[PDB]
Design a protein around this ligand. Structure first.
Ligand SMILES: NCCCCCC(=O)NCCCCCC(=O)O
Ligand SMILES: NCCCCCC(=O)NCCCCCC(=O)O
Lengths: 384, 384
């Protein structure tokens, strides 16, 4: 058993509604107003073909920027300097206000929600995961602290290989609804998490998407809110965003916290703006100054043994669901496969959003090109 | 085989992407911008509890109206007199701009798209279905004309019982993704349609949801557009709507034309406004004056042998995906189970939208109450 979870609607029984019950009472009052949560659905446009390129200022310093964006399969690109949008690009077929999957940039949003609850004293990072989710007893999350989850410093038997059909990535996806279920698969994301094991060691960085979903589970146990609602209440609804975000949900309504958020490029930039404003957003404080300071400060460098990341960023690290370059600019970024970044450049008070669709989830090739663009654009923003 | 269908995106292979392939190239460029079409998804609200009742004018004539709306599980209710919203109600927990499932009011929208294509001379109602969809040869739709589909005048072995777990309604839903698939079920909506049989007789009204999905299939074959896009291009994008509508899609991306559209009450009223304006909408003409005239005129009364409908509306009929009361007011309505109506009152140049969630799909009890409210509100709009 995975214990108590937030009901899909007020008074809902556990796991209700399902695909076979949503038309029946009492479920249908909720379901008829939220059917996209149950059944795949398409937008029918209220609006009756070419790329939009408004790179403007940085164009003089980076003449070939649009070509470099094309070469990295860029769908949306936006630079926010202070409060001003100073450069934008959207590929043909993608509108400025269209939403785009964030992949693991979603993790940085989840970490922010956790941070807000730490500020409220509802989560203590020093406490074991099992203090908040007892049902993870007997799993790899039995022993580690919430901070070690936040920092991805738990050794786990989870092969985070995005291409291997047999990897835990795919099983994770089948459990949550991103992929077709097999018989014998865990019923939902919570159950999948309880199946994970490890050798018990901690302290070394191991990127594992399951960690973020454990954080979201903790958020639910501490607030009593569905993660989807907690993500709105503690973050999204304070941004003065143009559009709702969306997040995929599994068959219990649990949001795919580690990778399933979609939003517009401009709205994602509002998250970066909040970070560079010390944790304050138009709708109120999201996280404490201290939390933001710790994100910008980085994690333990010695924990970061990922050769690929450190080849590019020798003094890099990871903390609280953010990647920290440790470079001379102090760049920090949310990062997702296929080329998603929420990139912070504190030196110039700027945020860079790049949302892409590389053919491959992650390779040194795309990694080098992507980071080259983000660094060049950052430097182009420097006072001269 | 069900023949050629509009690709989910430009250049897509048949049936691509699937739940297991959408992350791979070339699918992922499209899928990352449209993930809700593949995986159930929840809105993360950008906005930070009680019913809104602004019944206003008609309140004096119908003092107990709000109670009557509550008693019929009303979620949204809106009266448009001319171009003016003169009464509104939304239950606690449902916002004025929230979308609501239309159930078979969706059919009236599909019929409108067909009507537009008839105006363009791309569909001839007198022609057999097989003129446009040859693959329906050998099925119950082999022989009948497109008009007989529009008018629901084909005898079909399809038990339209919304509660019986064993009825064709459920198989239809399993084929399309509204319900959990069983082994042996048709793979998609098109395949399900090809399995339908009948005794070959025509001319008598038989309400069958499959008919509308055949119409949507015809729309796709004649335009080359996904039904979702055709619904936008020929109708929704001409309404000057506040929000996109949505429609559920099956595993090929085919919209659930007969029941799967959701939209706001105010936007649905724009469809009624278009009908009462002779087929013209803010964005241009949607259908011809003649088409609208034929809808308002009704179908053959003798074909209408449904005792339930005619008990309430003795001179009632059905044509072109609209129910026609044949009453002294000439009321016509789109109708969906659990209490959805797009109700036209030409006498007062008014449209009534009622979107509800009755516990039961359809019973004489709810039918009597629902129609009593719509008729009383219509009469309350009369000049005195
Ligand atoms: N479970 C399916 C979706 C999971 C998303 C994974 C993801 O986006 N991972 C990001 C990896 C970034 C690696 C950065 C680096 O090594 O330099
Ligand atoms: N296939 C699942 C959804 C199908 C929707 C069916 C629906 O909305 N039907 C409307 C029936 C109206 C009957 C009106 C009357 O008999 O008076």
């Amino acid at each position: 058993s995975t214990g108590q979870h937030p009901a899909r609607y007020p008074g809902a029984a556990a796991g209700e509604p399902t695909l076979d019950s949503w038309q029946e009472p009492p479920h249908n009052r909720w379901a008829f107003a939220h059917l996209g949560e149950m059944v795949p659905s398409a937008a029918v446009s209220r609006r009756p073909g070419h790329a939009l390129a408004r790179l403007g200022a940085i164009a003089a310093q980076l003449p070939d920027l649009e070509q470099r964006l094309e070469q990295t399969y860029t769908d949306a690109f936006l630079v926010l300097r202070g409060t001003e949008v100073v450069a934008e690009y959207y590929r043909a077929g993608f509108a400025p206000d269209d939403r785009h999957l964030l992949m693991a940039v979603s993790k940085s949003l989840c970490g922010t929600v956790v941070g807000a609850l730490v500020d409220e004293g509802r989560i203590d990072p020093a406490q074991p995961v099992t203090e908040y989710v007892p049902e993870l007893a007997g799993s790899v999350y039995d022993g580690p602290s919430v901070l070690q989850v936040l920092d991805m410093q738990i050794s786990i038997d989870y092969n985070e290989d995005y291409v291997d059909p047999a990897s835990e990535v795919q099983t994770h996806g089948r459990s949550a609804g991103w992929r077709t279920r097999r018989h014998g698969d865990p019923a939902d994301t919570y159950e999948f998490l309880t199946t994970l094991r490890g050798d018990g060691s901690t302290g070394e960085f191991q990127y594992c998407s399951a960690n973020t979903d454990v954080l979201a589970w903790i958020v639910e146990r501490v607030t009593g809110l569905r993660y989807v609602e907690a993500l709105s209440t503690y973050l999204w609804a304070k941004l003065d965003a143009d559009r709702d975000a969306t997040i995929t949900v599994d068959t219990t309504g649990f949001g795919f916290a580690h990778g399933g958020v979609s939003c517009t490029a401009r709205d994602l930039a509002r998250v970066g703006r909040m970070m560079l404003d010390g944790g304050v957003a138009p709708g109120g404080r999201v996280v404490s100054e201290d939390w933001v300071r710790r994100v910008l400060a980085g994690g333990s460098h010695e924990a970061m043994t990922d050769k690929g990341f450190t080849n590019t960023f020798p003094d890099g690290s990871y903390t609280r669901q953010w990647w920290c370059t440790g470079n001379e600019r102090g760049n920090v970024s949310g990062i997702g496969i296929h080329g998603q970044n929420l990139w912070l450049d504190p030196l110039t008070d700027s945020v860079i959003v790049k949302l892409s669709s590389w053919p491959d989830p992650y390779t040194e090739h795309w990694h080098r090109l992507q980071n080259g663009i983000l660094l060049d654009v950052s430097r182009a923003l420097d006072a001269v």
